[PDB]
């Protein structure tokens, strides 16, 4: 193990991934639009 | 094979010679169901010696003892029947046709060859699927019929014996998953020569699927009248043989 | 042999001893499911025996054979006009893809496709020109199939005189007759020798380096003479380094070794029926094709690895997976029954009796529980089968996913409303036999003015295993295609092998020399000349665009744009990020072009779009 | 006889004759006796048995086997269906037939013998008149 040191669901893995990724600027910018109008 | 079974069916009005109703002492403080002589007669003479036939029984309270529940209908529908088991079509819609009104369903009246004290597991196998979402409180009529005999008993089914027909779906032939006769109860059921009860029956007169598979549809949409109901092998039941020859 | 023998043969079979009780049995039922076992003789004898029983004349017009196989239809009609003694097509007849033969339009037994039968349906949906149908290998349960099980269903309701065949296997009769009404099954005997079957006591590391220690055991604990060996593999790559690691055993310590694919040319194919020597053992290593689609004699002993490369469609993801999955118990037992055929036998399992009891299903999943099935649902709203369609009678029923996103499949292209009933569109893509992608791509080919080109690269795409790349020769075979290259794509890179091919007078030895499958280029012209003769019954003209390729590429983009990636590449609407498969002329250490749209997405390795167009985005939001 | 077979045997083939030229009254004769006796079942069989030997079909075959002027494809095509003769019936468009049929020239004329086939409307109903008789 030393020396030494499904496929669908990392993919399916890898979806949601690329999904929240891209989604939370959306939520960052309406979190900062959000600031601005409680200003 | 049916050939045989044909000629049997002939002589079906002589086991009306032997009726006996499964009776235990009376319960004036639960229901009781009165099922039409005539209604018995005419469900016997058109049924099969081997093959099990079935139909649904509608009914309503009298004035005098609201527990007593008369049949007033048989309604014959869509079916294909089998050995110790049958293949029925939905509960009819029933109700856009005169004198229905007031109408309860009360249940399923059907043919067995074998003879129990208890719902067997196609009973409540198909009881469950008939009845479980949505009215269980309707009885079965179970009918052994036999050479020189019938033999009638009724039966309510608790909650255990249709949670156990929803956990067996279908049943292959010996499955015999934990059923329990205990899931069914005796139900007070009288024979009145008093009151005589009618037939439903589709409106295409045919009811009797068994040379027809391909024009049953289990989950359908069949329209339906009052009228005198055919016998298991008539001609229209049969078509194909007159094709043939 | 003569004209005389050719009726002993058929009275010596078992199918005779039971001939009368079966058309007695067709009599007296409108619907009949068959177990005929191997040595029944089944497919050859029935039909002559329903059609001498009177129903295939002018009485009740043809008789109709279901086969799921091309080359099937063909032999066992060649054999029964031959056993009934006519030129084929006169009385006896075949009717399959690019070829009807069929002399006279009452024509009394004709062997189809089951795609065949099932276009038919749409034209004709009661069938009239038929009295009886035999759907034989249904156990194979294709796609044609399986839909033909519930339009029988509901047809034979609308003419009872109707007669129907339903052949079986004995893991799914009851299941086949339950559906059709519980109507009566009829086993019949056949003439099989017992195989004596051992599952391995444990599960093997890797089933390749047990199967060839396995393979010398067999062939050298007997001595060499008289029993061969079939050996069942996951594929190509597999297959071919096996051979290569059980040369050399015998090498160190006679035995002849073959291989055999589909991708593998026809006349290596061919190579495995003729026969072998006495003290020499023949041994065939094989992938799933001699299951069925092959059938090999002299084989006393079979192993099998238990695994198969099974396609599965995911809906969520749009992606079809090519995986190692164990087989059915059916599948097992089916390459079980590869010995036994010649005489007496042996199956080695190279898996437990409990992975075969719970990790293998009885029956395989159904090719419709399990594929993309929008051809399928678009012939199906086609022939108005309609929220009828949406509650549709199959045997086993598709996932309710897999509908739903067909459904939105069509609903983009345009051919399914809002409310998910047929479009004019629908209607005319349906006549095309094709995936509604490659018909919305042809009939958009008119208006853009290309649809001289888009035939022949819609043919092309529709085609296997277009280029050959043996196992050392991966340079010189692409070397050879790479002369034909096209900057844009492997679809313009098609059009080019299409043009040479026949610039070259379609020529088989240049084919062989630039590495592509001759079989494949006929093929691709039959298809051409025939959705040529599809467009000229819908009256539609087959304009060129010439060196204008771009609005080829335009058309691509009416079909193709739920297909779509651009460079990390990242699939247009899911996000998921993807590859170019390393045959594409778009592949290498190499190129790069920013946004894409492609003909498959496919899980092999690698999650792998299969072949790969450049686009501009524009034209994206242009088409969809 | 009812289902019109075919026959080799001269001798057999002269026996049938004799039994269908003598079938119309002994059948009318057992009707007249299950009509008088009272019994509604065996007196309905036997009026469609009076109807069959005089007709050479079954109930199971269409009446347009009785239009003796029908073209035969149209007939074996309704016997397949399952569409009773009844629904068929309640056709009052010649396009429609056509279409019933799958065959726009045969609807004008089949058309014609449907508007031809004996049809009724009934409608009743009881008055008691007495405690025991009832009109």
Same mark, same amino acid.
């Not at chain 1, 399916?12 to 409680?38: G, S, T, V």
């Given at each position: ?39 | ?152 008993? &009724? ?31 005796? &139900? ?26 391909? &024009? ?30 | ?12 079979? =078992? ?48 008789? %109709? ?44 037994? #004709? ?13 004709? $949906? ?49 299941? +086949?007759?339950? +559906? +059709? ?48 060996? @079939? ?21 160190? %310590? ?18 495995? *029926? ?7 053992? #023949? ?42 999955? =164990? ?31 719970? $990790? ?28 009828? @369609?949406?509650?549709?009678? *199959? ?7 897999? *509908? ?7 609903? *983009? ?18 006549? +095309? ?6 018909? #919305? ?21 529709? %085609? ?29 890179? @098609? ?46 003209? %087959? ?82 | ?69 029908? /073209? ?55 008055? /008691? ?7």
């Amino acid at each position: 193990m030393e020396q030494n040191e499904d496929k669908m669901d990392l993919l399916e893995k890898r979806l949601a991934k690329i999904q929240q990724e891209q989604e939370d600027d959306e939520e960052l910018e309406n979190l900062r639009k959000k600031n601005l109008e409680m200003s | 094979e049916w050939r045989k079974s044909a000629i049997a069916n002939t002589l079906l009005y002589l086991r009306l010679k032997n009726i006996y109703v499964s009776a235990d002492d009376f319960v004036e403080e639960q229901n009781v169901y009165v099922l039409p002589k005539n209604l018995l007669k005419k469900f016997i003479e058109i049924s099969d010696v081997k093959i099990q036939v079935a139909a649904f029984i509608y009914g309503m309270s009298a004035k005098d003892h609201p527990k007593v529940k008369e049949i007033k209908t048989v309604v014959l529908v869509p079916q294909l029947g089998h050995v110790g088991s049958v293949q029925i079509s939905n509960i009819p819609d029933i109700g856009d046709l005169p004198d229905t009104e007031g109408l309860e369903l009360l249940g399923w009246i059907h043919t067995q060859t074998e003879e129990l004290k208890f719902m067997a597991a196609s009973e409540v196998a198909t009881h469950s699927k008939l009845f479980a979402d949505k009215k269980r409180d309707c009885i079965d009529i179970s009918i052994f019929s036999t050479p020189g005999s019938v033999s009638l008993s &009724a039966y309510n089914l608790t909650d255990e014996g249709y949670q156990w027909g929803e956990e067996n779906k279908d049943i292959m032939n010996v499955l015999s998953e934990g059923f329990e006769p205990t899931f069914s109860t005796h &139900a007070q059921l009288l024979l009145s020569d008093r009151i005589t009860g009618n037939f439903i029956i589709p409106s295409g007169n045919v009811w009797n699927y068994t040379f027809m598979g391909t &024009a049953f549809n289990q989950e359908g949409d069949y329209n339906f009248k009052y009228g005198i109901p055919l016998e298991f092998y008539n001609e229209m039941h049969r078509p194909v043989h007159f094709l043939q020859f | 042999p003569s004209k005389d023998d050719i009726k002993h043969t058929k009275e010596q079979l =078992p199918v005779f001893r039971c001939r009368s009780q079966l058309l007695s049995l067709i009599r007296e039922n409108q619907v009949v499911v068959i177990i005929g076992e191997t040595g029944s003789g089944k497919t050859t004898q029935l039909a002559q025996y329903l059609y001498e029983e009177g129903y295939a004349n002018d009485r009740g017009k043809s008789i %109709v054979v279901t086969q799921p196989r091309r080359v099937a239809a063909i032999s066992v009609a060649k054999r029964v006009a031959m056993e009934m003694q006519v030129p084929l097509g006169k009385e006896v007849g075949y009717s399959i893809r690019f070829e009807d033969v069929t002399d006279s339009e009452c024509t009394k037994l #004709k062997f189809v496709t089951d795609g065949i039968l099932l276009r038919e349906t749409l034209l004709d $949906d009661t069938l009239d020109k038929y009295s009886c149908v035999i759907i034989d290998e249904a156990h194979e349960r294709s796609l044609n199939t399986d839909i033909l099980l519930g339009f029988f269903k509901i047809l034979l309701a609308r003419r009872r005189d109707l007669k129907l065949i339903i052949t079986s296997a004995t893991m799914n009769a009851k299941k +086949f007759s339950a +559906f +059709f009404g519980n109507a009566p099954q009829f086993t019949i005997p056949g003439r099989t020798f017992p195989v004596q079957t051992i599952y391995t006591s444990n599960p093997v590391q890797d089933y390749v380096e047990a199967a060839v220690s396995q393979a010398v055991k067999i062939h050298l604990a007997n001595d060499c003479s008289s029993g061969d060996i @079939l050996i069942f593999m996951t594929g190509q790559e597999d297959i071919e380094t096996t051979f290569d690691t059980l040369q050399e055993k015998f090498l160190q %310590v006679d035995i002849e070794i073959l291989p055999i694919y589909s991708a593998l040319p026809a006349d290596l194919q061919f190579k495995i *029926f003729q026969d072998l020597h006495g003290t020499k053992r #023949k041994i065939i290593i094989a992938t799933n094709i001699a299951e069925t689609s092959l059938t090999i004699k002299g084989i006393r002993y079979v192993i099998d690895c238990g695994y198969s490369k099974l396609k599965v469609y995911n809906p969520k993801i749009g992606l079809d997976s090519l995986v190692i999955t =164990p087989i059915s118990k059916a599948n097992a037992d089916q390459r079980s029954g590869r010995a036994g055929r010649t005489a007496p036998g042996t199956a080695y399992r190279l898996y437990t009796e409990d992975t075969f009891k719970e $990790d293998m299903y009885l029956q395989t999943i159904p090719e419709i529980q399990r594929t993309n099935l929008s051809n399928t649902l678009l012939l199906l709203k086609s022939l108005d089968v309609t929220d009828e @369609l949406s509650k549709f009678p *199959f045997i086993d029923k598709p996932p309710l996913q897999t *509908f739903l996103s067909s459904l939105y499949e069509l609903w *983009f292209i345009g051919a399914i409303d809002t409310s998910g009933q047929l479009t004019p569109l629908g209607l005319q893509m349906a006549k +095309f036999p094709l995936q509604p992608s490659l018909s #919305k791509i042809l009939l958009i080919a008119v208006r853009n003015g290309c649809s001289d080109e888009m035939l022949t690269i819609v043919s092309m795409l529709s %085609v296997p295993q277009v280029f050959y790349r043996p196992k050392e020769r991966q340079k010189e075979a692409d070397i050879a295609r790479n002369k034909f290259f096209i900057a844009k794509s492997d679809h313009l890179t @098609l059009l080019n092998v299409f043009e040479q091919w026949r610039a070259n007078n379609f020529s088989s030895h240049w084919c062989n020399k630039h590495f592509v499958q001759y079989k494949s280029l006929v093929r691709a012209r039959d298809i051409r000349d025939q959705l040529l003769t599809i467009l000229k019954s819908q009256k539609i003209p %087959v304009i060129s665009s010439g060196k204008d390729w771009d609005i080829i590429k335009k058309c691509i983009c009416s079909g193709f744009a739920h297909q779509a990636a651009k460079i990390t590449y990242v699939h247009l609407k899911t996000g998921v990020s993807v590859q170019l498969h390393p045959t594409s002329a778009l592949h290498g250490l190499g190129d790069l072009p920013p946004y894409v749209v492609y003909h498959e997405l496919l899980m092999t390795s690698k999650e792998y779009i299969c072949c790969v167009t450049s686009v501009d985005p524009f034209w994206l939001m242009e088409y969809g | 006889y009812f289902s019109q077979l075919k026959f080799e045997g001269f001798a057999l083939n002269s026996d049938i004759v004799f039994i269908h030229q003598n079938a119309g009254r002994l059948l009318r004769a057992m009707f007249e006796i299950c009509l008088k006796r009272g019994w509604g079942h065996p007196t309905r069989m036997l009026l469609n048995l009076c109807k069959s030997a005089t007709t050479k079909m079954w109930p199971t075959n269409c009446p347009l086997r009785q239009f003796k002027t029908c /073209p035969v494809e149209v007939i074996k095509r309704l016997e397949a269906s399952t569409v009773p003769w009844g629904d068929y019936l309640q056709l009052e468009t010649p396009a429609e037939v056509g279409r019933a049929i799958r065959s726009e020239k045969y609807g004008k004329q089949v058309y014609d013998l449907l508007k031809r086939f004996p049809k009724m409307s009934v409608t009743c109903n009881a008055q /008691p008149i007495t405690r025991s008789v009832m009109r």
